[PDB]
Design a protein around this ligand. Sequence first.
Ligand SMILES: [K+]
Length: 137
Amino acid sequence: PKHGKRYRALLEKVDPNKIYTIDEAAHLVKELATAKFDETVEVHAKLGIDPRRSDQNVRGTVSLPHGGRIEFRNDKTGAIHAPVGKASFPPEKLADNIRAFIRALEAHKPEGAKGTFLRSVYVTTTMGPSVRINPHS
RNA sequence: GGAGUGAAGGAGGCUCGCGAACUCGCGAAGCCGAGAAACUUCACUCCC
Ligand SMILES: [K+]
């Protein structure tokens, strides 16, 4: 829809047709976080499961190496979401958290799930745009 | 692109306007939000 000049300047810093690496994304976080507070960094993943069946639910917990324990539970549309840190954190701590969340999802891959498990993975901030990442990077 | 729905983030968001101890701070300036609802993100469903 219609966005303001703060967000439109954030879109002139990202490439929609580029699969970023985890280290590139974590370094990009500070530039994509321009709201008037310390924003939260989020990881979103579209899962390769059938969310209409009860046996393919992805629901667990994981202790991130920088910050406490987080909870993750897939939605009925098939996607999964989790806060992985704040935007004032050093890039290496953010990249370590993104990697820890990815492994945690992959440790709870259900039987009966078909094909690629992490179909798309994105990194974004609270009030900013997203960047698609390679989860195996 | 439009109308909705779900989850997750979330205490701010958008528009203007000046001011110099540093992309930052102020304003009895309007509107929206701190209610599920702003704003942002991944998805889902329908429509030209
Ligand atoms: K967001």
